[PDB]
Amino acid sequence: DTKEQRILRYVQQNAKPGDPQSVLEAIDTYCTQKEWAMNVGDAKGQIMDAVIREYSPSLVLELGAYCGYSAVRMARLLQPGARLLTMEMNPDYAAITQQMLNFAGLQDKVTILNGASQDLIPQLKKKYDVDTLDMVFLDHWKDRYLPDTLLLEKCGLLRKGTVLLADNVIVPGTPDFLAYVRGSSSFECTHYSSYLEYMKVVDGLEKAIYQGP
Among residue numbers 154 through 213, which ones bind Cl ion (CB under 5 A)? 197
CB closer to ligand 72W, 19 vs 95 = 95
Decide: is 167 part of the binding site for ligand 72W (CB under 6 A).
Answer: yes
Cβ at position 148, least distance to ligand 72W in Å: 7
Nearest CA-CA partner of 96 in 135, 118, 64, 127: 64
Please state, in angstroms and rounded to a whole number, the distance separating the CA atoms of residues 76 and 45.
12
Query: Read out DSSP for 42-86?
Result: HHHHHHHHHHHHHH--SEEEEE--TTSHHHHHHHTTSPTT-EEEE
Binding segment for ligand 72W (CB under 6 A), chosen from 22-30, 52-60, 81-89, 155-163, is 81-89
Alpha helix locations (H) across the chain?
3-14, 20-33, 41-55, 69-75, 91-104, 117-120, 124-128, 145-154, 175-183
Cβ at position 114, least distance to ligand 72W in Å: 9
Ligand-binding annotation for 62, yes or no, is yes
Site string for ligand 72W, 49-78 (x = CB under 6 A): ---------------x-x------------
Please state, in angstroms and rounded to a whole number, the distance separating the CA atoms of residues 39 and 27.
9
* Contact residues for Cl ion, defined by CB under 5 A: 39-43, 66, 69-70, 197
* Contact residues for ligand 72W, defined by CB under 6 A: 38, 64, 66, 87-90, 93, 116-118, 139-141, 144, 167-168, 171-172, 196-197
Binding-site residue positions for substrate: 142, 168, 197
